[PDB]
């Protein structure tokens, strides 16, 4: 079956390319939402707000 699938080849190369693009896009989405800033601020010990 692998030998027979060999002569298709380009089809699941295309599929893997598409899925990798999707995964990279997911990481991009999370970064662009949450990594708006880069200075990791932290709260002061005193909560005198």
């Amino acid at each position: 079956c692998s030998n027979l699938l060999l002569q298709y080849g380009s089809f699941c190369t295309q599929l893997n390319r598409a899925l990798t693009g999707i995964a990279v896009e997911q990481d991009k989405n999370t970064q662009e939402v949450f990594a708006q800033v880069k200075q990791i601020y932290k709260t002061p010990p005193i909560k005198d707000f």
Binding site: S2, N3, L6, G9
Partner: protein, 45 residues
Amino acid sequence: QCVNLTTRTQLPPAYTNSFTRGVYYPDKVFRSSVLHSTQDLFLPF
């Protein structure tokens, strides 16, 4: 006729690294500027 040979000297069998060797044409078709993939009996690199 045939004669058995006597003068000999045995040694441990010699071994070597075959790297990027043992590749032959798969068919008889003129393919140029194409990266083609195939599966056959091949000498592993």
